[PDB]
Every structure is written in structure tokens, then in C-alpha cells.
């Protein structure tokens, strides 16, 4: 006797599934050795399939691919507020697999209501190659039976029979459920009546019986409730696990069920021969390109016609002509394209010269053609060179890609791969076949449009973004479980901080060494197990930012789909899984820095009429480096880090290759090689090669550009390529194989190394230690291809900040104008940078942030109630009739029809109409001026020329000025942020008692004790109230009332709060403000001046230190109030501040 499950859910039935793929697949194997099988039947997705099939296939288990599908009462198109039912589906042959992919695809695109649902209409369309099973208790035929509508169930059994035929079975499962008794007792009659045959299953959602609660909390996490709610999601019993053949016949006896429902499980799984193109198979689905030209010929053509642009001074019209005479401008490329590979190699045999370029070019192409990747390069180049002409910034490139010359010739890459040390052989190793990945950056604003270009260009059915499935984290796992177990949040987090952090993410709970915390509480015992019993599970399905696919055949025909909340065609198979099926995949990353370069250039073009042609700037521009050297990185890509900034200020880099090497070495590990870089760079330490005297004549060239440090991997490859006699290709393999650290496969390369090293120079003693030097540096060394690429951007950024520093800031502000916080911030940076930032101005403002003269001026768009039409409207009516002359002249040119009263209100509140006088006066005048305006046209449309038709706007109505607090209040209501001040500046008391500003909080606090308490004072902005200084914003746990807050910190949690008038009531103290320039003979100058008027007020000292500022609260002495009057009577600034103590 034996058995094999055909209904088993997995980690991939995301909401309710708790069976991890691995320990499930062994549990099935360890149960039955003989021809074991498992069907993967996830709830309405195919997420598992691939990554499952391949795990079981190399484990020793035959897999079967399946789908517990949601079938709608009626049409998948319905949206009824009947339901949706279950249905067990298995794919028997490969066509079946396709039709499964299709269904789950369609269930998502065409029929998504709550769950993704298929019609019986489409099921019938796609039945070819499928076996169905009557279904779990919630499926159709059983359900109807439960309802005493036998007459419908049999009718629906007939229907289903008309669809699959002798490939539909009656599903019999049993748990201790009375509903199952009645359903089967009839299902049993059916299978005998129509002549159907029964298959025994039992719907595993967990692996082994002990996974009961472990699972029954996974629910409590998907339901987000306590273990004791109730009403919390629960299953009906603890019986949904991968049972033994023996535990089965316990739910299905012998004299009641017979051998048929077992010997059918085995026999089905056998007839289910399904194979996924993978490994042994996997054909490259490189999509075709449209063009009397070879796929490869064109790419060749485009390259030539490219170099000529790329290298003006050294590849010419005349040059190509010379080549062809050894055998228009476009007309030469068209021809050089048609030289064959037997014909080419009759020239080489008869500093980067004109030839040198040809060779490398022709070589690259030779390796491209031979490999089968010319098409690829086209597809890629095409969409990129489109984005250029269509206002979509494209980054210089990323990763290995950069180093191919063809890549750079055809505008895929955009950095001269041979002016830097970039390598083709790192991007495409000639001596092993592997899909080269070409990732590309894009202006993030515009990225999707490129995807759309591809989408429309290659087919709406061939183009999708790739799926991503987050892992439950060991750290997080433990949290969520503890929520469930009725536990105080704190000790929860005291359990989280046990678990290590080995690299980026937390260590698995498998190895996790203060375990004695278990043996204390029996509550915690489970919590810890349960968390590791859940470790590997899944969250939900996000689109990958970068992932895109271009299939060659319709996607639906191999890879299933989804549409995400904002209508993206998404793949159900993950990154690897896709790439494992062998599909053309690519990253289309979004990149802020690019968008920022765009708005800068626009702002620059407007400011001073200068075309910023980023792909044509000198890379030796002094004033750029001198900035980075002064360490003014603030807005400059990549080197923005707290720490990294400091480094640069010491390195003082003079040429790009320094930014490149800085960037490359700055990360834990290599880091240390940085000081050396610096002392070598400042020119104070020789760069010596006495350790490999014979190898020097090979090293210097490679490592001199890097003050002697193997930083870049290419630098490594080259060393081997040159010293060992390695083909640059082979060289790569070396670096590759030293990465894999294959214990004893290394001593094979060692030999091949020395053996060649002799034949070139070094006498092995050097060789060995040199190889030692390689395996030493290679583990940390970097990809220059990538490094240099990005570096260029940092330069590009720095250059702007250096040469156009105002507009720079505007572009900053502009780009992130959608962050009330960042804007405030960017403002404050630019404010204390010599630049003023101005309110909008109906006269001077452009639409967006604008740079006028030397100031950053707002736009009208930024005004909160003003429509967008109305902003542009204002403008155009201000550019056909010139500059606005009065608020009258405004309201007659812009009727209420266009700018409503509300609009007007804010527009004044903003200060756009400041150009006219006092604000409060304006606001009240509006209404009676609109009564005037509207009346003017009534006169105007009644004949009457321009004197009888205008009683010209009587002067503005009158009212007392807007006091600051009330005035500032409006600005923000109107502009999201405050301009020209801040409430907290008006009543200083709160400043003077506060321990910090919001800015400094982070840096004052970290260094004190562990988890400190502190007092903070600013403005409130929430009903998790938000607190603001003139210096920042903090989440802390009504509107426009100032407070002082005593709160504990780690994000900051409040303990106590006081009202302004409670703070101006608590007794006062004296604070002398003192400069750092004080004498020995002053601290006892002050000391005596205080001694002479003692009392009961404490004394405080603000000592403005060179780097920071601290509050020395005197000592013994306590002054008696009268002191302030006699104290301001010397070069000392003073205040009667509230007394910091009390709080
Ligand atoms: Cl060295
Ligand atoms: Cl060294
Ligand atoms: Mg059905
Ligand atoms: Mg890629
Ligand atoms: Zn379920
Ligand atoms: Zn099920």
C-alpha cells in the first residue's frame, strides 16, 4: 500500500499557506521512497511552479503543477455585491501547463474581484491538457450538495463533465467534519452513477501535524489580531497536514472506501508528465528585430556610423575610405558592414590610435556575432536612443555593460570605455556562453514612458514587468508572532535586538546565543519556535522597480501575469525564475540624480541662456574638484554620506579617476586602503613595487593610475592577462574563480599562473606571492565599468553646484517640491548659503521655481488653492497684457470665471500679490473689488467705450496690519511651508529653555547615555503630533499653538508637555551669552560681577564653542534679578529666560 498527495498548498498560497517548499519536499520524500510525487496546487496563482519544479526535480521528487482556482458563479466579468467557488486543477501534459499559465494569467487580468477568478467559460476554452477534481468543501459540486440543491449540483456535475470529459474526478477528502460526511456520501453516489472514479486528497496548508498553532497564528498575522480575539481567523481543526498513507486510511477506512481512491492518487500523478524548459533545455528567447540587412550587419553598421560621431579627431570620413581602398558618410558604414570575418583578418598583420579603435571595435563585434547576441544589442540600443530624442534622460550606464566599446559606440553606454580602464571582456567573456545583462538608468520621472515605448513597440502581450516576493525576516517574524501572543511591545523589541545582523539583514533564527531567555517563560518558548517555523514565508507581490521582460513569443504562452494596483503588466514568476526560463530580461532603474540634472538644465537655460550639454563637458574642470575638495558635497550624487564627505575633504581629488577610486574603496573592508591612497595622493609617500621587481614592468601601467592599489577588478584581470599570459577572457575566469573560493580548484590556477609567469619574467618566488597578492585584493576589488560610469554623474552634479550654485538649489527645491519637509529643509540650506528664497509674485514669477537675477523665486503653481489652469492662465494674461499694475487691473483681466475668490485669497496669502501693498488690506478689499470688477463688464457689454465704462478701481479698502503669527499662519496654509520667518522666532522664551534644536537632536543625543530623555520646543501640526522648529520636523507622541516637550529618545516618544503661558509663568533665570573669545582674566570678571548681586535665580552660560555649543549652568552663585540691568551694561548679551530646571 501507498499514497501521494495531489492537493497540497504551499508558502505560495500567500494568505493561508504555511508549507515551506523545502521541508515539505523532503517530508514527502522521507514518507514514500518509491516513485514519490507532489502536486503544487496554490490558491489562485502559479507563483510556485518554476522555483518548485526545479527544487523537487533535483531532490528526487516528481512534481505536478496545479491550481486551486477561484471560479465565479457566473462570468469573470461579474462584480456582484453570487460568490466564487474553489476548483482543483492539475496539468497532465505540457499544453496543460500552458493552459494553466493562461488561466491564472486571465484570472488576474480579466476576472479580478476580491480574489482572482476564472469563468467556467474560459475554463472550457482552456481545458485541453487538464485534469480537474470535484473540489474542497468550498468548491461547487460539494457546496450545492450542502445546500440540498442536489438538482443543481448534478446539473453542474454534468456541465463540468461537458468540459473535461473522462479527465474530471470526484474529490474525496476527510477531516473530522460533519459537512464532509454528507458531501461525500453523495459525491460517492455521483462517482458511481456517471462512472467517474474518486481521488483521495486532503488539502495540506501546513507540513507536519505539529505545525497546527504555528499555522493558526500565520492566520492571526494575516488577520492582524490576538491569539484570543475571537472571531480571529481559524481553521475548523488541526488536520491539514501532509499525512502518511496510514493517517489517510484513518480518515478513509477500508470496508467503507476501498482501494480505488488510493490507487488513483498514484496513477494520476504518473500520467502527469510535465517538463519546464530549464537547465538541460532552456532556449534563448531573444526577440526578433524589424529591418535587406542581417541582424548582425546593422549593429555593425550602427557601430561604424557611431564611432565617427564618438571620436571626432581620430575617426574620420577620410579614414574609413582608406580602409576600403585597402579592400556621403552613412554610405561608408553601410559598406564596411559587409566585410566578412575571412576577409577582415588580412589587415592587422600589415596611446589609443585610430586603428586601435577599429580593432577593439571589430573584435567586440566578432565576439558579439559569434555568441548570438547582435539582435539583443539592437533591441537595447533602439529603445535607449529613442528615450534620448523623446525627453527622457539616460544615464552613462551601469555595471559591466559600460566597458564594451560597441555598447558605447551605439549609445547604450555613455562613457568612453577606453579613455578609462574599462574592459569588454568583463561584460562578455568570449570563452563562456552567458546572457549579458544590460541594465540602464533613466530619469525617474520619465522611466515608465520608456517601458511604454517597449510595450507598444514589441507587443502588449510580450512585454511585462517582473514580480518580486519579499521574505519574512527572522527579526520581523519574531515581532509579528509576539503581537499575537498577547505580549508587551517593549520586551518584544528586547527580543528582537538579540538576533544578530551579519550583513544588511538579520541572521536566521536557526543558529540563534542568549537562548536561556526561552527557559524562563513557556509563553516565549513557542513564540521563538513559531517564528522560525514561519521564517521563510512570504509577504505580497510588488512589482520590481527595475524588472522588465521582452519575450519573443506571447507571454501568456509560458509565463503568467498580473496587473498591479496602478495597471502594470506583471510577471508571476520571480527574477531568477524568469531568467531560468531563458527570457530577455533588463533593469530599467529610476534615478533621482538624472531628473535633477534635467530640471537644473531647464532652470539654467532659463536663468542665463546656457545649453548644459552633459555629454560634452570637460572632466578636468578645476572649480568642480576644488568644491569636492572643500567638501561641499551636500547635493552631490553618491558622495553625500555623513562619513564619505569627511573622506573627500582629506583626499582633495583632482581628476575623475579619484572620484572613481574614492567611491570604489569607500565601503567596509577596502575602506582601510584609503589612508594609503591619500598619503600617496598628497604626494608624501613613494608608490613602490620592490615586492615584485620582475613584475613591475607589468604592474606600473595598471596600478599607477591608482597610486598603487588594486582597487578595480579590471586592474586584476589585466595583471593576470599580462603577467601570466592569460587571454583577457581567461583572466576574468580567474577573478571569477577566486570569488567562488573553490578550496582546491585554486591550486590548479596557481600552477597555470606561475608556469606562464616564468615564460614572461617572474621567477615564481615573486609569482606565488603575486598570485597571493591577487587572491588577497580580488575579494574586495571593484567593478570600474560601474564605478566610473556613476562617478561621471557625481562630477556632472558637482560641476553644476560649482558653476551654477543658485539654479542648482532651485532645481533641488523644484525636484522635491512635493515634500513639505524637504522644501523647508532645502530652503534653510539655501537661506544660510547667501541665497534668498522668495514668495511667489504674480508679476515676476514663472510657473515653477525660477531664478531671477541671483535669487530663487517661487512659482504660482506652488500656491495651494490656485488651480493649475489658473496658474498658467494668470501667466498668459500677464504675457499678452504686460505686467500687472494694480489689484484692480488684475481682477478685470482675470475675471472670477478664471481665478475664483478662494484662489485669490490664497494667492494673496502666499504673497504673490504682495507687489500691491498691505496684505490684510488686500484680503478684505477683494470682495468689494469683485463687486466692482463684475460690474465694469456689465457697463462694458452695454456699449460704453472706456471712460463712461471705468470708474477706475477706487483705492484699496482699509484695515489694521497682519501681526506676524497671524501673517505666518496664512503663508503655510497657502504654501505648505513658512517663508520669511517662523512662529517660534517671535516669542523666544521657548528657544532658551530647550535643550536642543530639532536639527542637532540626533547629534547631541546619540552621545549621552542609553535611551535618553530630553526637552524640545517648537510648533504643533497634528490631531502623533508633529513638532517644528525653524530647523526641522519630528514625529512625536492643537494646530498653531507652541509647546515645550519632555520626551524620551532612541524617533522620539513624549512624556510631558507644557503650554506657553505655563512656561512664561514658571519663575525666571539669568542666561549670559558668552563668546569663545574670553580671557583667563574674565572667568573672574563675570564671576565677580555675579558675586556682587546674589539671590535666588540660577545662572546659565551659553558658550558658543568652535564646533557645537553647550549650556554651563553656573555653580554655587545665584543672582538676584537686578543683575540683568547692570549686566547688559558691559560687552555681554543677556536674557531673562525661563528656568530650565523645574521641567
Ligand atoms: Cl602592490
Ligand atoms: Cl599595496
Ligand atoms: Mg467548475
Ligand atoms: Mg539586468
Ligand atoms: Zn486555503
Ligand atoms: Zn484548497
User: How far is 992 from 428, CA to CA, in rounded Å?
Assistant: 64
CA nearest to 159, candidates 171, 168, 147: 168
d(CA 712, ligand 1 centre) in Å = 13
**Ligand nearest, relative to CA of residue 41:** 6
DSSP letter for 119, please. Answer: -
Q: In what order do the strands lie in the sheet with 1052-1059?
A: 1032-1035, 1026-1029, 1013-1020, 1042-1049, 1052-1059
Q: Using the mean position of ligand 4's atoms as its centre, give its distance from the Cα of residue 439 in Å.
A: 5
Ligand nearest to the CA of 233: 5
> Residue 664 in contact with residue 787, Cβ under 8 Å?
yes
The DSSP output letter for 201 is E
Separation of CA 566 and ligand 5 centre (Å): 27
SS (H, E, C) 515-541: HHHCCCCHHHHHHHHHHHHHCCCEEEE
Centre of ligand 5 from the C-alpha of residue 129, in Å:
25
DSSP string, 456-512: HHH-TTTEEEEEEEEEPPHHHHHHHHHHHTT--HHHHHHHHTTS--SBSBPPPTTT-
Tell me if 25 sits within 8 A of 61, measured CB to CB: yes
Domains, the chain: 1-275 (3.20.20.140), 276-469+541-591 (no CATH), 470-540 (1.10.10.1600), 592-961 (no CATH), 962-1143 (no CATH)
206 Cα: distance to centroid of ligand 6 (angstroms) = 12
Whole-angstrom distance, CA of residue 111 vs CA of residue 130: 20
What is the Å distance from ligand 6's center to 352 Cα? 67
Of the listed ligands, the closest to the CA of 689 is 1
Decide: residue 713, CB within 10 A, 0-12 exposed, 13-18 middle, 19+ buried. buried
Query: Which three cell numbers mark 607?
Result: 536663468
Distance CA 795, CA 619 (A): 8
Helix (H) or strand (E) holding 133: strand 130-133
Strand partners, 112: 116
Could you tell me the distance, in angstroms and rounded to a whole number, from the CA of residue 715 to the centre of ligand 1? 12
Q: Which ligand places an atom closest to the C-alpha of 15? A: 5
Ligand nearest to the CA of 136: 6
Q: How many CA atoms lie within 13 A of 943 on its CB side?
A: 1
Q: Is 1091 helix (H, G, I), strand (E, B) or coil?
A: helix
Long-range contacts of 1072-1080 (CB under 8 A, 24+ apart): 1072/1099, 1072/1100, 1072/1101, 1072/1102, 1072/1127, 1072/1132, 1072/1133, 1072/1134, 1073/1102, 1073/1104, 1073/1132, 1073/1133, 1073/1134, 1073/1135, 1074/1101, 1074/1102, 1074/1103, 1074/1104, 1074/1132, 1075/1104, 1076/1103, 1076/1104, 1076/1105, 1076/1106
DSSP bridge partners of 86:
139
Considering every ligand atom shown, identify the ligand nearest to the alpha carbon of residue 578 and give its number. 4
Distance from residue 794's CA to the centre of ligand 1 (Å)? 28
Could you tell me which residues are beta bridge partners of residue 1108?
A: 1105
- Helix H, strand E, coil C: the string for 46-72 is CCCHHHHHHHHHCCCCEEEEEEECEEE
Return the closest-CA partner of residue 15 out of 215, 198, 276, 177. 215
C-beta separation of 845 from 912 below 8 A: yes
| C-alpha count within 13 angstroms, C-beta hemisphere, residue 614 | 26
Written in H, E and C, the secondary structure of 982-1031 is CHHHCCCHHHHHCCCCHHHHHHHHCCCCCCCEEEEEEEECCCCCEEEECC
C-alpha gyration radius of the chain:
37
Quick check: 588 and 436 in contact, CB under 8 A? Answer: no
What spacing in Å lies between the alpha carbon of 322 and ligand 3's midpoint?
A: 74
Q: Return the sign of the alpha-carbon dihedral for residues 543, 545, 547, 550.
A: positive
Q: Say how far residue 420 (Cα) sits from the centre of its chain.
A: 29
For residue 443, what are the β-bridge partners?
591
Q: Which value, to the nearest 10 degrees, does the dihedral of the CA atoms of residues 895, 900, 904, 905 take? A: 150
Structure resolution in Å? Answer: 3.7
982, 969 contact by CB (below 8 A): no
Give, in degrees to the nearest 5, the angle at Cα 463 between 461 and 469.
Answer: 115
Would you give the distance in Å from CA 434 to the centre of its chain? 27
How many Å lie between the centroid of ligand 1 and the Cα of residue 786?
23
With a CB cutoff of 8 Å and minimum separation 6, the contacts of 112 are 563
Peptide bond into 230 cis (omega under 30): yes
For residue 703, report the distance from its CA to the centre of ligand 1, in Å: 8
Report which bound ligand comes closest to the CA of 6.
Answer: 6
Ligand sitting nearest the alpha carbon of 218: 5
- How far is Cα 714 from Cα 241, in angstroms, rounded to an integer? 53
Number of Cβ within 10 Å of residue 646's Cβ equals: 12
Cα 476 to middle of ligand 6, angstroms: 28
Pairing of strands 463-471, 569-574: parallel
Q: Are 57 and 24 in contact (CB under 8 A)?
A: no
Residue 72 CA to ligand 5 center (angstroms) comes to 17
Distance 797 CA to ligand 4 centre (A): 25
* Closest-CA residue to 764 (of 774, 754, 756): 754
Going from the C-alpha of 244 to that of each of 90, 181, 457, the distances in angstroms are: 22, 21, 53
Closest-CA residue to 595 (of 585, 603, 607): 603
How many angstroms is it from 572 CA to the middle of ligand 6?
Answer: 20
* Cα 733 to averaged position of ligand 1 atoms, centre (Å): 22
Ligand 4 center from residue 587 Cα (angstroms): 5
For cell 613602490, the residue is 688
Cα–Cα nearest to 89, from 159, 41, 50: 41
Neighbours of 424 (CB within 10 A): 26
43 C-alpha to ligand 6 centroid (Å): 7
Rounded to the nearest angstrom, the distance between the alpha carbon of 685 and the centre of ligand 2 is 12
- Rounded to whole angstroms, the Cα distance separating 1067 from 1097 reads 9
Cβ-contact 591, 442 below 8 angstroms: yes
Contact of 1037 with 1054, CB cutoff 8 Å: yes
Q: Pairing between strand 168-173 and 130-133?
A: parallel
Please tell me the distance from the alpha carbon of residue 489 to that of residue 615, in angstroms, as a whole number. Answer: 54
Q: Which residues contact 997 (CB under 8 A, 6 or more apart)?
A: 1029, 1030, 1031, 1032
Measured in Å, residue 781 CA sits from the centre of ligand 2 at 13
Choose among 358, 359, 362: nearest CA to 370: 362
- DSSP label at 141? H
Which DSSP helix (H) or strand (E) runs through 245? helix 245-251
165 CA distance to ligand 5 centroid (A)?
Answer: 27
Which residues in the chain have their C atom more than 2.5 Å from the N of the next written residue, marking a break after them?
81, 291, 327, 350, 512, 1023, 1037, 1050, 1083
Ligand 1 centroid vs 730 CA: distance in angstroms? 22
User: Where do the H-state alpha helices sit in 850-997?
Assistant: 868-880, 887-891, 901-910, 919-940, 964-975, 989-993
Amino acid at each position: 500500500l501507498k499514497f501521494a498527495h495531489l492537493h497540497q498548498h504551499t508558502q505560495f498560497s500567500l494568505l493561508d499557506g504555511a508549507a515551506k517548499l523545502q521541508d515539505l519536499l523532503k517530508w514527502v520524500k522521507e514518507t514514500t521512497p518509491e516513485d514519490p510525487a507532489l502536486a503544487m496546487t496554490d490558491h489562485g496563482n502559479l507563483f510556485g511552479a518554476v522555483e518548485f519544479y526545479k527544487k523537487a526535480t533535483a531532490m528526487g521528487v516528481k512534481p505536478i503543477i496545479g491550481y486551486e482556482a477561484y471560479v465565479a458563479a457566473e462570468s469573470r466579468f461579474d462584480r456582484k455585491r453570487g460568490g466564487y467557488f474553489h476548483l482543483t486543477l492539475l496539468a497532465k501534459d505540457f499544453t496543460g501547463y500552458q493552459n494553466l499559465v493562461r488561466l491564472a494569467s486571465r484570472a488576474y487580468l480579466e476576472g479580478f474581484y476580491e480574489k482572482p477568478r476564472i469563468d467556467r467559460e474560459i475554463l472550457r476554452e482552456h481545458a485541453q491538457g487538464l485534469i480537474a477534481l470535484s473540489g474542497c468543501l468550498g468548491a461547487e459540486i460539494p457546496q450545492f450538495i450542502l445546500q440540498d440543491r442536489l438538482d443543481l449540483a448534478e446539473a453542474r456535475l454534468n456541465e463540468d463533465l461537458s468540459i473535461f470529459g473522462d479527465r474530471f474526478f470526484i474529490e474525496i477528502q476527510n477531516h473530522g467534519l460533519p459537512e464532509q460526511k454528507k458531501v461525500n456520501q453523495v459525491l460517492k453516489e455521483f462517482a458511481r452513477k456517471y462512472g467517474l472514479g474518486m481521488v483521495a486528497t486532503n488539502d495540506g496548508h501546513y507540513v507536519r501535524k505539529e505545525d497546527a498553532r504555528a499555522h493558526e497564528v500565520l492566520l492571526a498575522i494575516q488577520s492582524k489580531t490576538t491569539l484570543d480575539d475571537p472571531e480571529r481567523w481559524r481553521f475548523p481543526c488541526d488536520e491539514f497536514y501532509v499525512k502518511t498513507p496510514e493517517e489517510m486510511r484513518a480518515m478513509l477506512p477500508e470496508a467503507e472506501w476501498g482501494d480505488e481512491p488510493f490507487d488513483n492518487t498514484v496513477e494520476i500523478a504518473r500520467m502527469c508528465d510535465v517538463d519546464l524548459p530549464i537547465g538541460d533545455k532552456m532556449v534563448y528567447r531573444i526577440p526578433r528585430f524589424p529591418l535587406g540587412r542581417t541582424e548582425a550587419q546593422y549593429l555593425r553598421e550602427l557601430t561604424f556610423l557611431g564611432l565617427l560621431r564618438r571620436y571626432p579627431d581620430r575617426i574620420t570620413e577620410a579614414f574609413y575610405r582608406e580602409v576600403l581602398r585597402l579592400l556621403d558618410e552613412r554610405a561608408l558604414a553601410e559598406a564596411l558592414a559587409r566585410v566578412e570575418e575571412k576577409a577582415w583578418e588580412e589587415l592587422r598583420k600589415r596611446e589609443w590610435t585610430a586603428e586601435a579603435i577599429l580593432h577593439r571595435a571589430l573584435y567586440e563585434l566578432s565576439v558579439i556575432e559569434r555568441m548570438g547576441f547582435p539582435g539583443y544589442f539592437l533591441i537595447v540600443q533602439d529603445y535607449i536612443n529613442w528615450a534620448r530624442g523623446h525627453g527622457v534622460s539616460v544615464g552613462p550606464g551601469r555595471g559591466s555593460a559600460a566597458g564594451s566599446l560597441v555598447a558605447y559606440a551605439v549609445g547604450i553606454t555613455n562613457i568612453d570605455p577606453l579613455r578609462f580602464g574599462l574592459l569588454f571582456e568583463r561584460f562578455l567573456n568570449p570563452e563562456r556562453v552567458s546572457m549579458p545583462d544590460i541594465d540602464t538608468d533613466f530619469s525617474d520621472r520619465e522611466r515608465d514612458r520608456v517601458i511604454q515605448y517597449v510595450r507598444e513597440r514589441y507587443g502588449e502581450d510580450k512585454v511585462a514587468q517582473i514580480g518580486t516576493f519579499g521574505s519574512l525576516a527572522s527579526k520581523a517574524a519574531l515581532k509579528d508572532v509576539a503581537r499575537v501572543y498577547g505580549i508587551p511591545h517593549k520586551k518584544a523589541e528586547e527580543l528582537a535586538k538579540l538576533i544578530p545582523v551579519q550583513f544588511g539583514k538579520p541572521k536566521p533564527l536557526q543558529e540563534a546565543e542568549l537562548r536561556a531567555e526561552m527557559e524562563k517563560d513557556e509563553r516565549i518558548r513557542q513564540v521563538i519556535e513559531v517564528a522560525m517555523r514561519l521564517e521563510g514565508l512570504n509577504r505580497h507581490a510588488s512589482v520590481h522597480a527595475a524588472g522588465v521582460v521582452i519575450a519573443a513569443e506571447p507571454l501568456t504562452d509560458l509565463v503568467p501575469l498580473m496587473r498591479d494596483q496602478e495597471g502594470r503588466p506583471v510577471t508571476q514568476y520571480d527574477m531568477g525564475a524568469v531568467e531560468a526560463l531563458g527570457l530577455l530580461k533588463m533593469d530599467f532603474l529610476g534615478l533621482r540624480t538624472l531628473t535633477f540634472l534635467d530640471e537644473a538644465r531647464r532652470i539654467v537655460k532659463e536663468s542665463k541662456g546656457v545649453e548644459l550639454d552633459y555629454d560634452r563637458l570637460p572632466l578636468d574642470d578645476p572649480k568642480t574638484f576644488e568644491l569636492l575638495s572643500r567638501g561641499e558635497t551636500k547635493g552631490v550624487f553618491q558622495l553625500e554620506s555623513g562619513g564619505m564627505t569627511a573622506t573627500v575633504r582629506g583626499l582633495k581629488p583632482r581628476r575623475l579617476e579619484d572620484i572613481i577610486a574614492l567611491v570604489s574603496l569607500y565601503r567596509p573592508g577596502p575602506m582601510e586602503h584609503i589612508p594609503t591612497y591619500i598619503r600617496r595622493h598628497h604626494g608624501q609617500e613613494p608608490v613602490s613595487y620592490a615586492e615584485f621587481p620582475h613584475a613591475e614592468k607589468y604592474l606600473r601601467p595598471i596600478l599607477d593610475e591608482t597610486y598603487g592599489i588594486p582597487v578595480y577588478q579590471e586592474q586584476i584581470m589585466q595583471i593576470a592577462s599580462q603577467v601570466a599570459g592569460y587571454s583577457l577572457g581567461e583572466a576574468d575566469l580567474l577573478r571569477r574563480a577566486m570569488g567562488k573560493k573553490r578550496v582546491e580548484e585554486m591550486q590548479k590556477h596557481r600552477e597555470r599562473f606561475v608556469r606562464g609567469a616564468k615564460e614572461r619574467g617572474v621567477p615564481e618566488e615573486e609569482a606565488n606571492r603575486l598570485f597571493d597578492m591577487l587572491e588577497a585584493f580580488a575579494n574586495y576589488g571593484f567593478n570600474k565599468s560601474h564605478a566610473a560610469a556613476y562617478s561621471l554623474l557625481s562630477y556632472q552634479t558637482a560641476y553644476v553646484k560649482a558653476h551654477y550654485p543658485v539654479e542648482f538649489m532651485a532645481a533641488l527645491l523644484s525636484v522635491e517640491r512635493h515634500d513639505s519637509d524637504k522644501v523647508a529643509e532645502y530652503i534653510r540650506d539655501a537661506r544660510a548659503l547667501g541665497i534668498p528664497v522668495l514668495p511667489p509674485d504674480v508679476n515676476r514669477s514663472g510657473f515653477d521655481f525660477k531664478v531671477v537675477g541671483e535669487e530663487i523665486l517661487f512659482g504660482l503653481s506652488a500656491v495651494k488653492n490656485v488651480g493649475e489652469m489658473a496658474a498658467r492662465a494668470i501667466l498668459e494674461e500677464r504675457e499678452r497684457g504686460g505686467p500687472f499694475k494694480s489689484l484692480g487691473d488684475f481682477l478685470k483681466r482675470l475675471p472670477e470665471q478664471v481665478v475664483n475668490k478662494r484662489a485669490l485669497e490664497s494667492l494673496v496669502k502666499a504673497g504673490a500679490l504682495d507687489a500691491f501693498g498691505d496684505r490684510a488690506r488686500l484680503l478684505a478689499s477683494l470682495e468689494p473689488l469683485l463687486r466692482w470688477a463684475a460690474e465694469t463688464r456689465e457697463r462694458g457689454r452695454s456699449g460704453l467705450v472706456g471712460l463712461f465704462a471705468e470708474v477706475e478701481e477706487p483705492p484699496l479698502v482699509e484695515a489694521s496690519p497682519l501681526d506676524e503669527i497671524t501673517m505666518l499662519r496664512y503663508e503655510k496654509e497657502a504654501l505648505g511651508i513658512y517663508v520669511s520667518g517662523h512662529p517660534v522666532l517671535r516669542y523666544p522664551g521657548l528657544r532658551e529653555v530647550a535643550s536642543c534644536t530639532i536639527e542637532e537632536l540626533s547629534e547631541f543625543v546619540r552621545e549621552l547615555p542609553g535611551k535618553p530623555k530630553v526637552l524640545l520646543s517648537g510648533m504643533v501640526e497634528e490631531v502623533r503630533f508633529t513638532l517644528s522648529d525653524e530647523t526641522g520636523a519630528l514625529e512625536v507622541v492643537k494646530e498653531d499653538i507652541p509647546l515645550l516637550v519632555l520626551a524620551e529618545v532612541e524617533r522620539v516618544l513624549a512624556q510631558a508637555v507644557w503650554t506657553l503661558e505655563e512656561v512664561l509663568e514658571a519663575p525666571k533665570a539669568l542666561e549670559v551669552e558668552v563668546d569663545h573669545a574670553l580671557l583667563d582674566e574674565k572667568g573672574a570678571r563675570l564671576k565677580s560681577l555675579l558675586d556682587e548681586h546674589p539671590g535666588s535665580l540660577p545662572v546659565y552660560l551659553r558658550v558658543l564653542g568652535p564646533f557645537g555649543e553647550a549650556l554651563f549652568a553656573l555653580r554655587e552663585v545665584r543672582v538676584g534679578e537686578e543683575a540683568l540691568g547692570l549686566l547688559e551694561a558691559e560687552g555681554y548679551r543677556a536674557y531673562l529666560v525661563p528656568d530650565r530646571e523645574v521641567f
